[PDB]
Design brief:
With about 325 residues, the chain is mostly beta strands. It has 2 domains: about 5-170, no CATH class; about 170-325, no CATH class. It has 4 helices and 25 strands. It has a 6-stranded mixed barrel. It has a 5-stranded mixed beta sheet with strand order 12-14-23-15-22. A hairpin with a 7-residue loop joins strand 1 (about 5-10) and strand 2. The longest helix is centred in the C-terminal third of the chain and has 8 residues, at about 225-230. It is globular and about 60 Å long. The two termini are about 25 Å apart. It is classed as hydrolase. Keywords: room temperature, jungfrau, hydrolase. It forms a monomeric assembly.
Length: about 325
Amino acid sequence: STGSATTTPIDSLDDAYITPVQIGTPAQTLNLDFDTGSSDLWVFSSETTASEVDGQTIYTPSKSTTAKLLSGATWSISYSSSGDVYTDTVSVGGLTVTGQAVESAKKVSSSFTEDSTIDGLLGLAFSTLNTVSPTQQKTFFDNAKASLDSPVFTADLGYHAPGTYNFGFIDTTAYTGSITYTAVSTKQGFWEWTSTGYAVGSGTFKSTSIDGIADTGTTLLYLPATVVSAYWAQVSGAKSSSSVGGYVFPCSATLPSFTFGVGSARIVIPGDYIDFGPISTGSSSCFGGIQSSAGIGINIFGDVALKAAFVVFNGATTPTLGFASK
């Protein structure tokens, strides 16, 4: 079997993408953030303290006939949120998984409460990072793998437009040219991989190894200080501000494109994708799309980078990552 769902940006800047998901019988449709950077399926529930809910759709397990409490199991995660665990039927664009662990939130940080559009997260990293204790639970993709035609899923995120998440197949019309596959390392539990270099604007390709993670749940591109300093050196008037917490540039400037190497191929990010609008309403300074990873511990290839390509997350015995131009 296969699954296909549409994903839509939450706002004008592409801060996150929400996908409708059917949890329960009769179904309750929640709008979740598909995150390849984590491994938990958690939702705003009927058990969340009422003060931390501000417009979100809530999951109510008392109203579902296929819901069962996973007695004794508990979760706690930080990127924060914690609570109870139930098992129920989850379906994504027609693809149905019975017995999925659905993590019911009891506590949620104010960063989630302020985002009324996001009803929860659907973790798509490797199951080793699942926070359910004492019995670690499997992700939606790991539970569907046996029932899928092919153990894969693709990501076709749109620039100021909706996009798609397919499961069990590859759409040969969604991209141009061919797909370039690279080796994944599952040691840290992420879709970890090595880029073969970069180029700023119409410049020369600097061949160098950049180890990072492909993360749909992170908005921006976080690369090393040397690479980020080389980029912003080409934008007149750009500068790393302490007060803002990163690079900013005069909104009147035109950004050059950025290229990242996948094996022998090249994936181009247009300049426009790197502009995250003004810092405050009516401001003359704009926020940068390429920021330094120095204070994180890992390079993150977020939405800014991923939405310039047709990305394949091959979950075979030996996982790989595929990138193609679109």
